[PDB]
Amino acid sequence: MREIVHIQAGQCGNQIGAKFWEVISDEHGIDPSGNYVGDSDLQLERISVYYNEASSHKYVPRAILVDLEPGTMDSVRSGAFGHLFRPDNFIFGQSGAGNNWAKGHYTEGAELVDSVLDVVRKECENCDCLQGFQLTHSLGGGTGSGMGTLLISKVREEYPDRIMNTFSVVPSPKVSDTVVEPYNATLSIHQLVENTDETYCIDNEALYDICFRTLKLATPTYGDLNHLVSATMSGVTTSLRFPGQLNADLRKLAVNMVPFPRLHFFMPGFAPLTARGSQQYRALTVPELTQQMFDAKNMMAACDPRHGRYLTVATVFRGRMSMKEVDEQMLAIQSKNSSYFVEWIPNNVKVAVCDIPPRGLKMSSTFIGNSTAIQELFKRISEQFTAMFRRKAFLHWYTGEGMDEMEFTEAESNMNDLVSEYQQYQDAT
Amino acid sequence: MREIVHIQAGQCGNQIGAKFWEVISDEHGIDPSGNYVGDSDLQLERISVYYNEASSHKYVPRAILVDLEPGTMDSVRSGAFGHLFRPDNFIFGQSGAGNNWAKGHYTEGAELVDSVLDVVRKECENCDCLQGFQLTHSLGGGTGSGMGTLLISKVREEYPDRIMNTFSVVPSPKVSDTVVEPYNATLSIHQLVENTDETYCIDNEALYDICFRTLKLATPTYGDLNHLVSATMSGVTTSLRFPGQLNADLRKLAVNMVPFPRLHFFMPGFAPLTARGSQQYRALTVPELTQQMFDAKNMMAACDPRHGRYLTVATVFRGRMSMKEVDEQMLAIQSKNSSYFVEWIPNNVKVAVCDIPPRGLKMSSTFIGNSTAIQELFKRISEQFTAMFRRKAFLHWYTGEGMDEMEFTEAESNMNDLVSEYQQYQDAT
Amino acid sequence: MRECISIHVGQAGVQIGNACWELYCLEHGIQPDGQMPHHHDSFNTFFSETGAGKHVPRAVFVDLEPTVIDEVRTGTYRQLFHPEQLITGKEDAANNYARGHYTIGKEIIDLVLDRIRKLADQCTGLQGFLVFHSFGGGTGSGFTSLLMERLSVDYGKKSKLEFSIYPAPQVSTAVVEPYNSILTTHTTLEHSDCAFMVDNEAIYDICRRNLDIERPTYTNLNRLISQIVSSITASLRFDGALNVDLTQFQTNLVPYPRIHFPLATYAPVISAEKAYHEQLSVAEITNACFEPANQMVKCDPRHGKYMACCLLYRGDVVPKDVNAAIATIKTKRSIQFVDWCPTGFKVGINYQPPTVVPGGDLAKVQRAVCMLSNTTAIAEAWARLDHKFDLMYAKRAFVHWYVGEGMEEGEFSEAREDMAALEKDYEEVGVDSVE
Amino acid sequence: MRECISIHVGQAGVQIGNACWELYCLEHGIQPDGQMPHHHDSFNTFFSETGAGKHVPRAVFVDLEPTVIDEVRTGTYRQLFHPEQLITGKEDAANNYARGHYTIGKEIIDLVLDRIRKLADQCTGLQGFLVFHSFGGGTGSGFTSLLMERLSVDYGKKSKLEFSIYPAPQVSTAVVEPYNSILTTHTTLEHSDCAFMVDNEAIYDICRRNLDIERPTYTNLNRLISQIVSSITASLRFDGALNVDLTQFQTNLVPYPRIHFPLATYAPVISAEKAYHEQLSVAEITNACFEPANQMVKCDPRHGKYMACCLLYRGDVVPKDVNAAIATIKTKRSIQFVDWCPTGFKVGINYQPPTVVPGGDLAKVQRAVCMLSNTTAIAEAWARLDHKFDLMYAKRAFVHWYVGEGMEEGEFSEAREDMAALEKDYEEVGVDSVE
Amino acid sequence: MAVNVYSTSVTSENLSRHDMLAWVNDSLHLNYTKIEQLCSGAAYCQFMDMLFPGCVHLRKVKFQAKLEHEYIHNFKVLQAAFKKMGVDKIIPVEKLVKGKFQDNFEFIQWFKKFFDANYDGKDYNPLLARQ
Ligand SMILES: Nc1nc2c(ncn2[C@@H]2O[C@H](COP(=O)(O)OP(=O)(O)OP(=O)(O)O)[C@@H](O)[C@H]2O)c(=O)[nH]1
Ligand SMILES: Nc1nc2c(ncn2[C@@H]2O[C@H](COP(=O)(O)OP(=O)(O)OP(=O)(O)O)[C@@H](O)[C@H]2O)c(=O)[nH]1
Ligand SMILES: Nc1nc2c(ncn2[C@@H]2O[C@H](COP(=O)(O)OP(=O)(O)OP(=O)(O)O)[C@@H](O)[C@H]2O)c(=O)[nH]1
Ligand SMILES: Nc1nc2c(ncn2[C@@H]2O[C@H](COP(=O)(O)OP(=O)(O)OP(=O)(O)O)[C@@H](O)[C@H]2O)c(=O)[nH]1
Ligand SMILES: [Mg+2]
Ligand SMILES: [Mg+2]
Ligand SMILES: [Mg+2]
Ligand SMILES: [Mg+2]
């Protein structure tokens, strides 16, 4: 009941998704071959939410992995933990989008969008009671941002009364992976603010910074990087997968987290984060967990909250604890740090508690904050896009495959409108 | 009780019949040598419908294979599973019809039809209570088409009060196997419309697409194509061959499917069709069975039902299931796809259920649809024939052996009348 | 159980038949002495089996000059042929159609017909005749016309395929070639079901380019033509997934009574060295056989429109990719059909891979294609031959020889008008018309 | 599933191609004969696997003089190449642009396009063509301008990358280099997606100083150039943490249609003995690749401003230090970017450490970098070449050879003004603009 | 004879997707709503008729094509018209007929350039030409 459909687009989505189904399988005790090997019967009480029952007690994930180039599917299929995905869902093209909007939303996207949409429609009919969709993609690439938006537009047309989340990977302020980042990002957000209920923005250096100082890792590869994102994205869902003292679900978070339709860009966070060596000198208890997750150092988006004010905040604990300890400290955090919370929203903290701890830990938590400091991220991106567009640089490879000048103009005006209203509420009395 | 006489024509009929008798022997547990080796007595309960008992507990099929050229007979006799047919039934000429209606209907037809009629009469007088006739052939070849038409005419004259099915391989739109297809196709279809009862049109290119796309086969060959066709034929006959919860017969299917004497051209389909690799990731169940059945891509006639409306539909399940599920999902399909169903025929779905599953499968299903998309096939054939006859090409070689232009004119008029009536009944309110 | 007999007329016919019978003996596993060490019957269709294990071919070698027939007699295939079958005259026709059809050819025609009749009555399921003859040669042309007339009189309606040798546009060995060719075409236009047409210059170019031989004597051309003939007959001789017959070829290829002059092509024709670096797929062998430069008659089909095509694949062939490749070829830009032939392909598949003669130029191949195309580009060849004949006849050259050997100029005039009518019919049928 | 074909034109292309294709066989473990003793495919993007275990490359070697192609035929890589692919003429262009583009080249252009179409239709997912041509030569410039015009018409929008050889500033093998280079650039300007520039003079210094070799024959230079070519296409053949494709290169380096002239660079380039005393970290080879003396074209990037860059690592490379090293490079005051390009870096990481050819100068390295900087400093190279062309053309020297071979004096003026249009186009956008 | 033009990479000359559909609709006075609907080739055959009077038998083509086999015959007529006028652009007919945006947009992009090169400014009413 209330199962969700997982869609992975681009190379980042496939690499994040490959580590995501590693954690989910471990939580439910599913062998890589696809058969249940767990012990506690609480795991199989709600297995239909993510996995799908098949013949001979085999379980197949409800995932749809799609990328425009065949490089990514080669690794996941041939590599380990690729014997359990359903081979029908492995949809791929032949030529990459080439870091282009047009070659990922109009020219190459159209060929593949009709094939994936039929796989999506098949899963829903098999589904008993749909809950929503989950999308992991990037805002800098061509297929992850171009076509990933195309699925959002088409799916939102067929299932208007559903809630879907995007675990995007927002670009960087310091070093840009691709030269034409602003053209792809600005055009993407102009489509995301319309057909998405809630979006979790994630950076890469704030993940490098966390994995450098807090985790004590000098050489964090992409395997140790995506492993941090997976826990955050699996922490949100775990409320409905397992019983808890004070339950929550995907729709419950959206009601509390989103005061206004255009203000649905979040900043995740995880705790506890400790190195292997220094875990024996800390007593795992609720006091440090709330303290640890509320500092700007341990946040997964490179945006310091001290420059803004939290509109509303969620905190999805896990493990087992005492409800008094949890509620005692949220009030303490609010009163002491009262200068960073908006005034026209009282008691702006939402708390939920589950009952199943993560693997190898007594208790943990996930912090989701709809802060105002996100305004600075959009201000910077619109700054880079503005300078490039006046000189009309790199643009003769976006007009050549379908768009025009008028499309960019409407994308920047919408982007500038969102920043103005994201700030005029911070200063509103 | 209710025995069926099988007739095979041409190379296509011979090869399809060879595969069909392989499948039937596998179903009934009959050794290639001709002696019973299986276990369950339910197979022996009704063995006289197709086979025929003989001394020393032998079983010989009631099949009459006959074709002008001898190569096919030599192949079927020298090859395996040729030790069980009765050599008296092995009738052949010396020279092929040369893809000519004249040589297939008047020149060699006389001698071949005389001998074949003698054999047919002997077999029928041997039979206890005749049920009907089965004829598998092609509408593009010379011998199969012409001599099958002659056999149908003579047998219809001899036994007016009986039913006969014709499994005809209709020509393909993209590529034509023989240059002069339309003349033979038009003449044969005119004769079939005049004096046949029901006809399941089967195409080759649609079979090719089904095998390449769904079954995921790199090198689809005639063995596989004939395997699919034989599976369909066995699924049709299993209802009266085996006991079931809700039995059905050939007469029942005919009366439920045919509303008018000139409308008896069906399109078959079989489910489930899965590749070797992907069978483990699917749950064999009635919902997916019906959803797989009711999509155009899994149709064995190269005509898209989306272009027309289903006049009537029959569905023969196999194996063990639940009538509640069966009729619930039939109702769901009818409600969802109502715009594709004719308004003045309510409840236009016939359902039958057997009890013995096909070999190596828990359950299966055969869907027979009488639709209005065959209108397009007849229109295309009529257009091709009209162009060739207007330019007066290849026609001296049909006049040189008996016929004249009057026959062609009347055949074209009959084809146009039939297609016009088909369309005008499609567009009724 | 099905028997067809072959008549080889003239030196060209005899040499082509020698190559073809060597190929058949290799294919069916028959030793040159007649003994032997799909297949079981096969050899029954060609090799009549006598009391002992010896097999004798159903061939009738006929010639007027005895030199080449004596060469065949003393050749390595001496014990195979029935000695009575090899019929030889005393003096040749000397490139004189009148001499080979009226004066000399009337003195051996009765014996040839008697041998043909005995061979036909020996068999019980006679299918047809295969006539191997040239066009320029006087005895070839004259005796071909005489045999056509006599066989048509004797046996009413049977398949009579011919394998001619059209004169090359530039390469020439004789001087009275236009007279001989025009006369033979006018005489045997009516008594032939289907005539396959082959030119020496195109085969020269194919052997030079594709096979890359700089010393292509007549043996290589004979081997190529023999391969084409064997590919045509393989459907009768062997089982396959989709069989065709001589009547099928004839019916599918001749749309009009006069238009029965198709042209042949074979693929792949590659050497041994180039074989390893090639993958030899069904699609690419179809493309190569349909390529314009691979045609074995010196004419470009691009200059005209196709009318009918017959593809015959033999070997490890899958009908799915066959049909895919044929659809691609139809979609291609070079191939353009006539408006009144919506369906323009007849396909046959055989399960027997082609065999390779020993010491031959070709390499072993698991897939082979023979293409028989009836098209319009042959009209240019007919017009060129007519122009040569008109230029020569404008001032009555060699007509003294032709008239002295029992002919009249009325025959020349009738042949000219018949050829003009045939060309006009060909062009009119090929060209499009409104309504 | 992904296929790209390479065309080698002239002696420079063939000699480079002989060394380059030696590297690919080593990388994929292909013996010179063709057999073999990240990998499951890999070689399918370059090596078309035939019926047997043999693999044949997707290369088209075209030249007008048969002197150098014959060396390849008899060389150690004799059984690898498809014998039909090696296309040869009869006489060379003789350093004349008109001869290799108008008179002599036209008689062989049709044959080359025939082999290109045969190889392209065999493949299914064709991405683009790699062209290895020089600039000073006759057939490497005149003929390669003919291929671009012909290829672009047949295939509309496909990648076309040129690995050219710019004439050196002081070193000069030929004497009519300004005439040939100016004419080629004006013709192939509109038909090239991205052309990589490599100069022979700059590579001599790199081999002399860094590699410490005083005997740098043309064999040594081609090995060093070949490593750049392999790193460009190293992402297609191998997996990685962050892949790039042939199209991604084209979209990230060309801000304006005319400005598509980047210059390559490789790192590390060290000898065998100097390797031990160097720790070879990621943070320094990025620094090493940015030094002004390591650039492969004789021009200092300090004199201009960078427009876009492209790094390509491979081996034991972790993305954290890659992004840390680039951040330090950006803040260094030697590297200065243009105002309208706030983002100026594209990265790509591969998991395949570069291999070494036996007998080569370079040592085994677990990390490597290939840099493609599109910089304004190349505008100096255009100005210098335009100075030479304007100097000799004023008095009409050497023109009588070009005019008499099928050209006009008017055609020279059009190519002169076109380069003047590009020269100020390059400067007017690299310089700042008001507001 | 007709003049030819190539198209590889041009700036400030390629038109927007919306404007290209408007030009096709305006020239022939019809209601194509998607550019990918140009798979039929009926509009393409009419373009050759406008560029060069005659050279195409407009009676052969039919504008009510809705099937995969019907789409090909329309393009075969266009193949002959290209040869007669001596143009040398190979139509990838195997890829246009599938009705996808990629291949259908590139061909019209080339055809727009061909249209301008061989246009003398003549005008007529396609409605009477179509009927
Ligand atoms: N978190 C995380 N991000 C990644 C990882 N790999 C790449 N990225 C980011 O994702 C972007 C990759 O581009 P994609 O959206 O995947 O584009 P693509 O799949 O290569 O297809 P094209 O855009 O056509 O090249 C890069 O800019 C990186 O910043 C990863 O392993 N983990
Ligand atoms: N389903 C199926 N169809 C086939 C197969 N083989 C051939 N066909 C079709 O059947 C037709 C065969 O012609 P036939 O009716 O058998 O005629 P024939 O046996 O060759 O004898 P003639 O008509 O005298 O030439 C062809 O047009 C094919 O389209 C097969 O193996 N399976
Ligand atoms: N393809 C092929 N053609 C041949 C061969 N030998 C002869 N010819 C053709 O035969 C023609 C010569 O006329 P023939 O048919 O041989 O006449 P003949 O057999 O010498 O007898 P006469 O006509 O009396 O001289 C030449 O134009 C050749 O084209 C051969 O071995 N192969
Ligand atoms: N990098 C490199 N450049 C070479 C090599 N061999 C020749 N060149 C370049 O090629 C130029 C000589 O002209 P080519 O391009 O070779 O002309 P060609 O191929 O000999 O053909 P023609 O112009 O007709 O003589 C010289 O200026 C060199 O810069 C080589 O081995 N390596
Ligand atoms: Mg990618
Ligand atoms: Mg037959
Ligand atoms: Mg002679
Ligand atoms: Mg040279």
Numbering used by the authors:
A (entry chain F), B (entry chain B): 1 to 429
C (entry chain A), D (entry chain E): 1 to 37, 40 to 42, 47 to 441
E (entry chain S): 1 to 131
Sentences reproduced from the published study:
Microtubules are tubular filaments composed of αβ-tubulin heterodimers, which adopt a pseudo-helical geometry. Microtubules switch stochastically between periods of growth and shrinkage, a property called dynamic instability, which is critical for their function. Microtubules are stabilized at their growing ends by the so-called “GTP cap”, a region enriched in GTP-tubulin as a result of delayed nucleotide hydrolysis after GTP-tubulin addition to microtubule ends. The structure of the microtubule lattice in the GTP-cap region differs from the one of the GDP-microtubule, allowing members of the end binding (EB) protein family to selectively recognize the GTP cap, binding there with about ten times higher affinity than to the GDP-tubulin-containing microtubule shaft.
Here, we generated a hydrolysis-deficient human tubulin mutant with the smallest possible modification by replacing the catalytic glutamate residue by a glutamine (αE254Q). EB3 bound to αE254Q-microtubules with a dissociation constant of 8.3 ± 2.9 nM, as determined from measuring the mGFP-EB3 fluorescence intensity along the length of αE254Q-microtubules that were pre-polymerized from GMPCPP seeds, surface-immobilized, and then incubated with varying concentrations of mGFP-EB3. To this end, we imaged undecorated microtubules and microtubules decorated with an N-terminal fragment of EB3 consisting of its GTP-cap recognizing calponin homology (CH) domain. EB proteins were observed to induce compaction and a negative supertwist in all previous EB-decorated microtubule structures solved to date. We report here two EB3-CH-decorated structures with a negative twist, but an expanded lattice conformation. This expansion means that the presence of a glutamine at residue position α254 at the catalytic site can inhibit compaction, possibly arresting the microtubule lattice on its pathway toward the GDP-microtubule lattice state. Remarkably, the EB3-CH-decorated αE254Q and 20%Q + N-microtubule reconstructions preserve an expanded lattice (82.87 ± 0.00 and 82.89 ± 0.00, respectively) while displaying an induced negative twist (−0.23 ± 0.00° and −0.28 ± 0.03°, respectively). Considering that any previous structure of a microtubule decorated with EB3-CH showed both a compact and left-handed twisted lattice, we can conclude that the presence of αE254Q can block the lattice compaction of a GTP-microtubule lattice, even when only a fraction of tubulins carry this mutation as in mosaic 20%Q + N-microtubules. In WT microtubules, a negative protofilament twist may be transiently required to facilitate compaction of the GTP lattice to allow for efficient GTP hydrolysis.
